[model samples]
Target: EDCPQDREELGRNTWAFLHTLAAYYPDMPTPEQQQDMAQFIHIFSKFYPCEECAEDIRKRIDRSQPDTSTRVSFSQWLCRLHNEVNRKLGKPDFDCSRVDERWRDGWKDGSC
Candidate 1:
């Protein structure tokens, strides 16, 4: 049988999944696509494994609705959101300016 995930492992997997989703999102998503993305976020927040983290995300989402209009915008939005969570954890925030290079473009030096 598989072992249960630790908090750190769960967090790592969740971040990877969400970042990959944003990295591959359509440049100009159709209305249905946008709606689906919004709904996905809503449901994911509700069902997040960590209750406190989910509550924090829900509050943040309520304050600033998701920006799912385009690939770049969505990725940037996720970067900012990740930074917010990092701040709460006393971690250094990621640079949103380099999100594309980090997530999609691999990196300027090709050190992916």
Candidate 2:
């Protein structure tokens, strides 16, 4: 799991997992994972840090991640990724309230 390939796979898997999570629970965090998520977000926010006054963070990362090939602006890339999570998780519409209020049985909903 600690291999380079595993790390790459983990990055991709994590991206997919986050998307599914967003769609399933748009507004609320799972009680079980809340603390873990908070910790993760805190750590993630550090890697994706914010400047004292600047709004765009993508600009700050090294030329390695958002390089010429990716060419993604910080906010744009992040917002797009966040939307994927919301979509996959089956959460309520963007402007609507959250779903997964109680974490019903897996198959009850149109999801696992």
Candidate 3:
């Protein structure tokens, strides 16, 4: 089969094909579900239970958010999706080992 000749072609292929896979699945969840998921991810990210991964998460979070008002931050949001996917796939506590629950000290479960 023919292959992509350059990075641009690869990028285009990646972008196009990634969503194409979704076409095979059932109608995707609604926007509300996506928003709810964003909030859920923000909440649990504070408890990065894995001690080692906590450093990386901390660095990422720091880089991602300078203020608390915006809820759609990269690190915070990604961690949420990461943990949720793991939980759904029966891979609980996967990221737990990388972060430390102790860091959740004094954290509150604020609404997103």
Candidate 4:
């Protein structure tokens, strides 16, 4: 716990923060809100610390695109984005439907 964040460390930590951000994102964010996320993603790609890692995200967002129009759209889109990386890395797919439970709303299915 002394060194800076490597790719994997930053990757997982960023995803965790992003998903939680999406979970708390307003259900009907206005244009400014939507644009903020889009801009953040664009900016985030530029400063991801790892050139290859940042480039990969740029490619993904350029092709897959980002839809921060609404909470559901943004959150669901982000979830898919994560899964795309998961698939590439042989990681398991996260349940989009249960995102609220996973990041917020607390899980009704079980205890914390």
lDDT of 3 by residue, 63-94 (tens): 55322222223223444534544564486544
TM-score-best of 2 and 3: 2
Q: Which of candidates 1 and 4 reaches a greater TM-score?
A: 1
lDDT of 1 by residue, 1-112 (tens): 3889877788888988999899999999999999999999999999999898899999998998889999988998889899999999999989999888877788899898
TM-score of each: 0.94, 0.28, 0.27, 0.90
- Residue pairs with backbone overlap in model 4: none
List clashing residue pairs in candidate 1. Answer: none
| CA RMSD (A), model 4 | 1.3
- Ranked by TM-score, the better of candidates 1 and 2 is 1
Question: Which predicted model would earn the best TM-score?
Answer: 1
Weakest ten-residue segment in model 3 by summed lDDT = 98-107
lDDT of 2 by residue, 14-83 (tens): 5445434444432444454545544543455466322431223223332223211111222233344444
Which digits, one per residue and each the tens of the lDDT, describe model 4 over residues 1-112?
8889888998889988999988888899989988899999889889988898888778899997789988888889899888888888899988889888878877886887
Where does model 4 exceed 4 Å of error? Answer: none
Worst 10 residues of 4 by lDDT: 103-112
What lDDT does model 4 reach?
0.87
